[PDB]
Design an enzyme around this catalytic site. Structure first.
Site, PDB file in Angstrom:
ATOM      1  N   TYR A 131      -4.577  14.066  -3.302  1.00 48.39           N
ATOM      2  CA  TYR A 131      -5.004  13.398  -2.087  1.00 48.39           C
ATOM      3  C   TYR A 131      -6.185  14.077  -1.407  1.00 48.39           C
ATOM      4  O   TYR A 131      -6.120  14.383  -0.215  1.00 48.39           O
ATOM      5  CB  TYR A 131      -3.853  13.308  -1.068  1.00 48.39           C
TER       6      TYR A 131
ATOM      7  N   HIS B 215     -10.088   7.909   2.837  1.00 45.00           N
ATOM      8  CA  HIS B 215     -10.022   6.571   3.386  1.00 45.00           C
ATOM      9  C   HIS B 215     -11.413   5.955   3.556  1.00 45.00           C
ATOM     10  O   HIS B 215     -11.479   4.800   3.970  1.00 45.00           O
ATOM     11  CB  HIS B 215      -9.351   6.589   4.754  1.00 45.00           C
TER      12      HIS B 215
ATOM     13  N   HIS C 211       1.617   4.096  -3.169  1.00 53.15           N
ATOM     14  CA  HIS C 211       1.343   5.533  -3.129  1.00 53.15           C
ATOM     15  C   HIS C 211       2.416   6.273  -3.937  1.00 53.15           C
ATOM     16  O   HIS C 211       2.101   7.237  -4.628  1.00 53.15           O
ATOM     17  CB  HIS C 211       1.317   6.090  -1.712  1.00 53.15           C
TER      18      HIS C 211
ATOM     19  N   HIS D 253       0.845  -1.194   0.000  1.00 52.18           N
ATOM     20  CA  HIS D 253       0.000   0.000   0.000  1.00 52.18           C
ATOM     21  C   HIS D 253       0.883   1.248   0.000  1.00 52.18           C
ATOM     22  O   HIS D 253       0.704   2.156  -0.810  1.00 52.18           O
ATOM     23  CB  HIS D 253      -0.944   0.004   1.193  1.00 52.18           C
ATOM     24  N   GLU D 254       1.842   1.298   0.923  1.00 52.81           N
ATOM     25  CA  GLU D 254       2.682   2.487   1.037  1.00 52.81           C
ATOM     26  C   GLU D 254       3.471   2.714  -0.251  1.00 52.81           C
ATOM     27  O   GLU D 254       3.374   3.768  -0.889  1.00 52.81           O
ATOM     28  CB  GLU D 254       3.608   2.394   2.243  1.00 52.81           C
TER      29      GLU D 254
ATOM     30  N   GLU E 222      -6.081   6.149  -2.565  1.00 50.17           N
ATOM     31  CA  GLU E 222      -6.184   5.159  -1.508  1.00 50.17           C
ATOM     32  C   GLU E 222      -6.619   3.778  -1.988  1.00 50.17           C
ATOM     33  O   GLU E 222      -6.035   2.756  -1.610  1.00 50.17           O
ATOM     34  CB  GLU E 222      -7.207   5.627  -0.457  1.00 50.17           C
TER      35      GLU E 222
ATOM     36  N   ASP F 203     -10.899  13.760   6.965  1.00 51.54           N
ATOM     37  CA  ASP F 203     -10.057  12.775   6.283  1.00 51.54           C
ATOM     38  C   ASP F 203      -9.798  13.200   4.849  1.00 51.54           C
ATOM     39  O   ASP F 203      -9.787  12.427   3.895  1.00 51.54           O
ATOM     40  CB  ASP F 203     -10.737  11.412   6.401  1.00 51.54           C
TER      41      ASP F 203
HETATM   42 ZN   LIG Z   1      -2.796   5.146   1.835  1.00 55.70          ZN
END
Ligand SMILES: [Zn+2]
Ligand SMILES: [Ca+2]
Ligand SMILES: [Ca+2]
Ligand SMILES: [Ca+2]
Ligand SMILES: [Ca+2]
Length: 316
Positions: free
Chosen positions: A157, A231, A146, A142-143, A166, A226
């Site tokens: 974002y 998310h 990005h 996931h990281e 995301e 958020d």
């Molecule tokens: Zn993320």
């Protein structure tokens, strides 16, 4: 640093033993010269200045408790490197074998991990809500993903572009997990989330509503929290991706699944050739349809299922 390529051994957050690629120069460093221009892991030493110190070990054995997050951030970065290269013919996150760097032991009780524009950062968790987040390969991928998005589509974002951002990270996180094929699922962060509760997860792609996330566009969040819910509304796209791969009937809409690999071929192409910094859910469906069309033909099952899937999450 300059040194001789070696292989160390230790165990991860979950107590599993693995080998890791190290570099020897007086100490052994968590630097893997076998993938692109290197994979580098550092100790932030419970502080928040980054990246910290390139991880050094005297004997190349990594079985201390303190070692564990490092071992796994290093190892799952390599697995994530291997997925993009073998599966998508992509060389690191920038496509030109940029060095991959990660820092662990970030802060104290930091219940999170992230990509900061240049590198991956993992907290240790407070040991209640989270254990060191590097233990989850879906979290690591996931990281890094990005990173991939930032060099490709550049999805801002915030709001729908952010939820797309995301979702892409959750989709590829998941695909990489299935790729290493160790207990894979369509859930997010389960390996390192709530050590005290089995069965739960930070997020679910199969049933986002499990955790208060929307699985239909009409249930989309539009407050300013958020980042306008990046998310939260990610669940609408996650569900869609789940459906393209796996199939199902959602709010009466039947989708024919086409499996993981084609999902991954279709979303990777959308990400790299069609999406842009301000794409919204609608543009994403169009991007995915074009991609599927590019890959399998306008009259294929693949294009059809993509359409079914977005139809089912109410995305036109
Ligand atoms: Zn993320
Ligand atoms: Ca050691
Ligand atoms: Ca799992
Ligand atoms: Ca998972
Ligand atoms: Ca748990």
């Amino acid at each position: 640093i300059t040194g001789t390529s070696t292989v160390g051994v230790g165990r991860g957050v979950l107590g599993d033993q693995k080998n890791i690629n190290t570099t020897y120069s007086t100490y052994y460093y968590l630097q893997d010269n076998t993938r692109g221009n290197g994979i580098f892991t550092y100790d932030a030493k419970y502080r928040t200045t980054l990246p910290g110190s390139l991880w050094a070990d005297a004997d190349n054995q990594f079985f201390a408790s303190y070692d564990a997050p490092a071992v796994d951030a290093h190892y799952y970065a390599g697995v994530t490197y291997d997925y993009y290269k073998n599966v998508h013919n992509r060389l690191s996150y920038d496509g030109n074998n940029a060095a991959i760097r990660s820092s662990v032991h970030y802060s104290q009780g930091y219940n999170n991990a992230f990509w900061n524009g240049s590198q991956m950062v993992y907290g240790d968790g407070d040991g209640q809500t989270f254990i060191p987040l590097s233990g989850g390969i879906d979290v690591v991928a996931h990281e890094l993903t990005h990173a991939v998005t930032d060099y490709t589509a550049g999805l801002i974002y915030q709001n729908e572009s952010g939820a797309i951002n995301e979702a892409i990270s959750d989709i590829f996180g998941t695909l990489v997990e299935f790729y290493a094929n160790k207990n894979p699922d369509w859930e997010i962060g389960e390996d390192v989330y709530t050590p005290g509760i089995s069965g739960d997860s930070l997020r679910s792609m199969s049933d986002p509503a499990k955790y208060g996330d929307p699985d239909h566009y009409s249930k989309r969040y539009t407050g300013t929290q958020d980042n306008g819910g990046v998310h939260i509304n990610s669940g609408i796209i996650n569900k869609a991706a789940y459906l393209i791969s796996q199939g199902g009937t959602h709010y009466g809409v039947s989708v024919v699944g086409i499996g993981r690999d084609k999902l991954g071929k279709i979303f990777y192409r959308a990400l790299t050739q069609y999406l842009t910094p301000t794409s919204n859910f609608s543009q994403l469906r169009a991007a995915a349809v074009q991609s599927a069309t590019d890959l399998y033909g306008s009259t294929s099952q693949e294009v059809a299922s993509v359409k079914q899937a977005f139809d089912a999450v109410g995305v036109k």
